């Protein structure tokens, strides 16, 4: 009985309350789920090509503004004139510009050199960036085939190749596939096989931050389990430098003097930044490393401002308050903000007033104001991603970067409040009781204002166990070319010589699960960090360290040509047969298929250790009597495993003796029939 | 409390059920809410304006 319904009533509490707790946490993970940063990515002005090099740039206060590029074939002679109003002339005499955006790898991807020539550098500098951000995460880039992974890349139309009405001489049809912001996300989704929503956003100087905002929305609603968020402004032709001189907004030195009295223009720089975004639960469940956590982000427009280019104050306050409100955080929870800091004499005052309004009005500690453009320059559509890169690197190193050219704080901004502290010196930012939080603001010339809130990664990674083992896990590394293989050995050797003390099994595990299986494979089983570094330097020079190169070309549209003529050396053993699921399934299927007419089993010959079978070895072309049945069984198994292990084949044919062999993998057989 | 055994805790049923209904309705209005087409503006070939 139920004590006159007391059990029934209270038990219905115990389900309704539990369901409410589940549904409200579903509200929380569906509206304010803290999405984490898995890997970092950047090709920023100067020598920056990796996030660690960008931190080396920020920590020592180096400015990337050096000068105009010369690899691009720029005229550079009509680009300037004593008359500031001359058509065809720019005003800034430099700016931080990429020295490697001119070059791209066609052969690495499924791109022809003819195609890659017409590819917009912005897109070329997203294919490589997506690859390298996937590697850095410990996630094999080729393992994300036909998987939900949204792409959000911000760009700037500008102009790169010839007129599309006039076409070209070598490039005719792939000029579309290059000079379109559209395919600047579709390419990445296609080469990497990503099935997630491929959106290429375009919101001027805030495109990257907008893209990360949308990626946050996609993950919070759950449309894509993974998100590809980033932005870029490659600088192919000097036209936009010429015409941003026409309204007299470019700083003649090309430097972003953010919040400085010497701000004589907002300058300009070209760069690229990219992020991996996804919900923290999916991170810590899947084991993906968490660099930082992006809690809340808002996107708004300036409205009817003093023109399309002029910023708005109230709209900026609204966006940087709405980001906090949607993040569940506030002005007092942010220890250091990353403002736009475009560098113009007009945007900076209103921007700092907005910062003082949303944050400075109620501050317990002075807010540390910083600007990545001071060290880099205004990266336009790559601004907002560079800011979050700077803040996440400050998280991971526990130090606030300097804001260059900010010693003389702007006289047009009221700093007497003291709630905002300009980051003219490196301020330590150690982990403490307060969760370290940062904010990135980007205000595009289109008027779209965006702001995001970056909380430190929850320090739950600590607690890892330590042990030792005799397992000499092979250091497997693969590339798309022999020179790429030699360079992948050399860079790994340089990393292990500049970052010593990394345990060999950790290195092997990172090289194995996180580096894709590329069609040029060199591997070795190290015993010591010296014997491993010697092998790495040997592969770098190009000698035979194991005499083993796993060669191939592609995986898509594979036709399974089946030539015989002797292969499939008997070199299997215990555990090996049970490492691959489809491999073992096919071997056991071939085992169980022949009951009535055959009784010999290949598994005892396979699972037998081959360390003792290497002293009487012979070539596979003269042992056809014994090798051929093994050829047939292992050929069935290997065809079945290579059908789906990262390969999307198109058909199967037979070059020689692989005809009935691939007919038996077409079905239409029984026990007796297959045996016969 | 007074007769039977449930006139203070059934109120807890009522409040919890209302809250759960309002939360699931929030779920369906944030992920399944119909979005109305207020008006339509087009410029299309053939003189369509």
């Amino acid at each position, epitope marked *: *009985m*139920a*004590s006159t*319904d007391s*059990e*029934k*009533v209270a*038990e*219905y509490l*115990r*389900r*309704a309350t*539990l*369901d409410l707790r*589940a*549904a409200r946490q579903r509200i929380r993970e569906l509206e304010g789920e803290p999405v984490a940063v898995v890997a970092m990515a950047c090709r920023l002005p100067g020598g920056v090509s990796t996030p660690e090099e960008f931190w080396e740039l920020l920590s020592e206060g180096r400015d990337a503004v050096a000068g105009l590029p010369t690899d691009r074939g720029w005229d550079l002679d009509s680009l300037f004139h004593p008359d500031p109003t001359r058509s065809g002339t720019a005003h800034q005499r430099g700016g931080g510009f990429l020295t490697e955006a001119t070059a791209f790898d066609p052969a690495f991807f499924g791109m022809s050199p003819r195609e890659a020539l017409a590819v917009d550098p912005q897109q070329r500098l997203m294919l490589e960036l997506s690859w390298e951000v996937l590697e850095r995460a410990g996630i094999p880039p080729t393992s994300l085939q036909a998987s939900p992974t949204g792409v959000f890349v911000g760009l700037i139309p500008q102009e790169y190749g010839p007129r599309l009405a006039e076409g070209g001489e070598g490039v005719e049809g792939y000029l579309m596939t290059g000079t379109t912001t559209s395919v600047a996300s579709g390419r990445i989704a296609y080469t990497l096989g990503l099935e997630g929503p491929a959106i290429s956003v375009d919101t001027a100087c805030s495109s990257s931050l907008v893209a990360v905002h949308l990626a946050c929305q996609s993950l919070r609603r759950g449309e894509s389990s993974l998100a590809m968020a980033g932005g870029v402004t490659v600088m192919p032709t000097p036209g936009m430098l010429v015409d941003f001189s026409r309204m007299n907004s470019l700083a003649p030195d090309g430097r972003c003097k953010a919040f400085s009295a010497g701000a004589n223009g907002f300058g300009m720089a070209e760069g690229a930044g990219m992020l991996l975004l996804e919900r923290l639960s999916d991170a810590r469940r899947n084991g993906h490393p968490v660099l930082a956590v992006l809690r809340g982000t808002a996107v708004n427009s300036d409205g009817a401002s003093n023109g399309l280019s002029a910023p708005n104050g109230r709209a900026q306050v609204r966006v940087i308050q709405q980001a906090l409100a949607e993040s569940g955080l506030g002005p007092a929870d942010i220890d250091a903000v990353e403002a736009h800091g475009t560098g113009t004499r007009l945007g900076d005052p209103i921007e700092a007033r907005a910062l003082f309004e949303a944050y400075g009005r109620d501050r317990e500690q002075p807010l540390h104001l910083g600007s990545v453009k001071s060290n880099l320059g205004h990266t336009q559509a790559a601004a907002g991603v560079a800011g979050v890169i700077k803040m996440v690197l400050a998280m991971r190193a526990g130090t606030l970067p300097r804001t260059l050219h900010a010693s003389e704080r702007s006289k047009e901004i009221d700093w007497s409040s003291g709630a905002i502290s300009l980051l003219d010196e490196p301020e330590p930012w150690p982990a403490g009781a307060r969760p370290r939080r940062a904010g990135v603001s980007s205000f595009g010339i289109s008027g779209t204002n965006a702001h995001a809130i970056i909380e430190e990664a929850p320090q739950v990674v600590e607690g890892e166990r330590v042990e030792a083992g005799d397992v000499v896990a092979p250091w497997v590394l693969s590339a798309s070319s022999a020179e790429g293989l030699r360079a992948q050995a050399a860079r790994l050797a340089a990393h292990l010589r500049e970052h010593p003390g990394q345990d060999p099994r950790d290195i092997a595990y990172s090289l194995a699960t996180g580096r894709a299986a590329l069609p040029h494979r060199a591997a070795f089983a190290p015993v010591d960090e010296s014997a491993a570094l010697r092998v790495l330097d040997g592969l770098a020079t190009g000698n035979a360290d194991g005499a083993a190169v796993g060669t191939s070309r592609a995986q898509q549209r594979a036709v399974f040509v089946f030539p015989g003529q002797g292969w499939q050396w008997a070199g299997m053993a215990v555990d090996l047969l049970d490492t691959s699921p489809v491999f073992a399934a096919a071997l056991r299927e071939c085992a169980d298929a022949l009951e009535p007419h055959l009784d010999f089993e290949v598994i005892p010959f396979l699972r037998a250790e081959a360390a003792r079978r290497e002293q009487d070895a012979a070539l596979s072309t003269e042992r056809v009597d014994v090798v051929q049945p093994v050829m047939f069984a292992v050929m069935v198994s290997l065809a079945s495993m290579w059908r789906a292990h990262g390969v999307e084949p198109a058909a199967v044919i037979g070059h020689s003796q692989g005809e009935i062999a691939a007919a038996c993998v077409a079905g239409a057989l029984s026990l007796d029939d297959a045996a016969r | 409390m007074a007769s*039977t055994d*449930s006139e203070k805790v*059934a109120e807890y*049923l*009522r409040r919890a*059920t209302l809250d*759960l209904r309002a939360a*699931r309705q929030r*779920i*369906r209005e944030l992920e399944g809410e119909p979005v109305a087409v207020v008006a339509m503006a087009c410029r299309l070939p053939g003189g369509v304006s």
Partner: antibody, heavy 118, light 114 residues
Framework: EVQLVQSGGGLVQPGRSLRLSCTAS????????MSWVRQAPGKGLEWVGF??????????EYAASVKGRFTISRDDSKSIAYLQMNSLKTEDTAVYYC?????????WGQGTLVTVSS | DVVMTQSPLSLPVTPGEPASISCRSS???????????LDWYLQKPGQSPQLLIY???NRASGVPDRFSGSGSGTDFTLKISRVEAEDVGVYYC??????????FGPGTKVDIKR
């Protein structure tokens, strides 16, 4: 999360005892009242009995067909539920379920084959 | 006396169509608290069942919101908006006004319409 995983399946003949244990993890065990249901093979479930929570205290109900045969006990420190078979007969040949509530069987374990065959 | 509860049995459902299962009660299951005391369960063929609806209309968590239900003081209706390939099994219209609950009802083994 939650799991009321069971254990104690086996093959017995009528007239002896059998063990059924329900592992509780992911929640406070003394808050929910354990119940046990039996599923005859190929046809509908037919309930067995339940025990009330310690804070409530209460008593134990069993089905009219298991009076004086089956008993249920519970504990918080080890958080394992107990369904006891004594003097088994043929009708007990069925898969039993561990249910998470006296009247709301809001969670259900996988089920263990309790077979009493001759 | 014991409440006589017999849902209409044998409701085949084919994927992509709206179905609806009713249920019977001898006397009213609507208590003085204004709430119904009948529960809705679906028996997996092959493993454990799960909860669809309690209070007669209040749905449980975990299961999708497709399992909608309502009812009058006596008449009840687990009114299932649609079914799919996995929505096949045995639905139990169990009451909760009179402990013991005992059997879960003969049960509504439901299948694919054809």
């Amino acid at each position: 999360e939650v799991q009321l995983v069971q254990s104690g399946g086996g093959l017995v003949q009528p007239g002896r005892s059998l063990r059924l244990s329900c592992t509780a993890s992911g929640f406070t065990f003394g808050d929910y009242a354990m119940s046990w249901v039996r599923q005859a093979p190929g046809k509908g479930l037919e309930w067995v009995g339940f025990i009330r929570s310690k804070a409530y205290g209460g008593t134990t109900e069993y089905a009219a067909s298991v009076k004086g045969r089956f008993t249920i006990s519970r504990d918080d420190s080890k958080s394992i539920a107990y369904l006891q078979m004594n003097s088994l007969k043929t009708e007990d040949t069925a898969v039993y379920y561990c249910t998470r509530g006296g009247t709301l069987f809001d969670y259900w374990g996988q089920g263990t084959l309790v077979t009493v065959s001759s | 006396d014991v409440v006589m509860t017999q849902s209409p049995l044998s409701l085949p459902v084919t994927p992509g169509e709206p179905a609806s299962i009713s249920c019977r009660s001898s006397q009213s299951l609507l208590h003085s608290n204004g709430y119904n005391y009948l529960d809705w369960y679906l028996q997996k063929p092959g493993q454990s069942p799960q909860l669809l609806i309690y209070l007669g209309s209040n749905r449980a968590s975990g299961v999708p919101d497709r399992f909608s239900g309502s009812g009058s003081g006596t008449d009840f209706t687990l009114k299932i908006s649609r079914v799919e390939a996995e929505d096949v099994g045995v639905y139990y219209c169990m009451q909760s006004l009179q402990t013991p609950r005992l059997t879960f009802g003969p049960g509504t083994k439901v299948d694919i319409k054809r």
